[PDB]
Design an enzyme around this catalytic site. Sequence first.
Site, short mmCIF file in Angstrom:
data_model
loop_
_atom_site.label_atom_id
_atom_site.label_comp_id
_atom_site.label_asym_id
_atom_site.label_seq_id
_atom_site.Cartn_x
_atom_site.Cartn_y
_atom_site.Cartn_z
N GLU A 11 0.80 -1.22 0.00
CA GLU A 11 0.00 0.00 0.00
C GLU A 11 0.83 1.27 0.00
O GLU A 11 0.34 2.32 -0.44
CB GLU A 11 -0.94 0.03 1.22
CG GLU A 11 -1.95 -1.10 1.25
CD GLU A 11 -3.04 -0.98 0.22
OE1 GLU A 11 -3.28 0.14 -0.31
OE2 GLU A 11 -3.69 -2.00 -0.05
N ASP A 20 -6.73 6.24 -4.79
CA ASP A 20 -6.28 4.87 -5.00
C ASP A 20 -6.39 4.51 -6.49
O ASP A 20 -6.71 5.35 -7.34
CB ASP A 20 -6.99 3.91 -4.05
CG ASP A 20 -8.43 3.59 -4.45
OD1 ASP A 20 -8.92 4.09 -5.48
OD2 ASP A 20 -9.08 2.84 -3.69
#
Length: 162
Positions: A11, A20
């Site tokens: 991440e 994202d």
Amino acid sequence: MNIFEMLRIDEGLRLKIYKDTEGYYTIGIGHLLTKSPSLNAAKSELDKAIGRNCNGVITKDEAEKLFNQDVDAAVRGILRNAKLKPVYDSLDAVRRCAAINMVFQMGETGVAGFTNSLRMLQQKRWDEAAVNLAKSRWYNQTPNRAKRVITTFRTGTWDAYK
Ligand SMILES: [Cl-]
């Protein structure tokens, strides 16, 4: 290696609101804020999550605490789900990390489409499960992430992360 290091690699860490891979407002170590297109809605969710007026920016300590909460929520979601818990309990510790990783990324609802993969994992048919997991929107949209997670399920080792 452990689940925290694995997800930190997958991440990254950003201390200001970002988008994202799907375009959703996110912060920290992959913490989804909202699927709304409104940056103001995302800023409001952030302040609520942290407990102060952040104006879109957090500290590293805040990011790490949010991350711990998010990992715990993923584990608890698996354990409360009658479809996921028996599969999770059948896996060794390394493969359990791969399961948490998928739930962290896609949620319980996103993993619901993986019924056939879950059965193969419970039967320990690792190569067949790996092929089945790759026949997914998940693999086609985030292939490098998916390859690392699938390799972890296939081998039961951390080799993809080393
Ligand atoms: Cl990727």
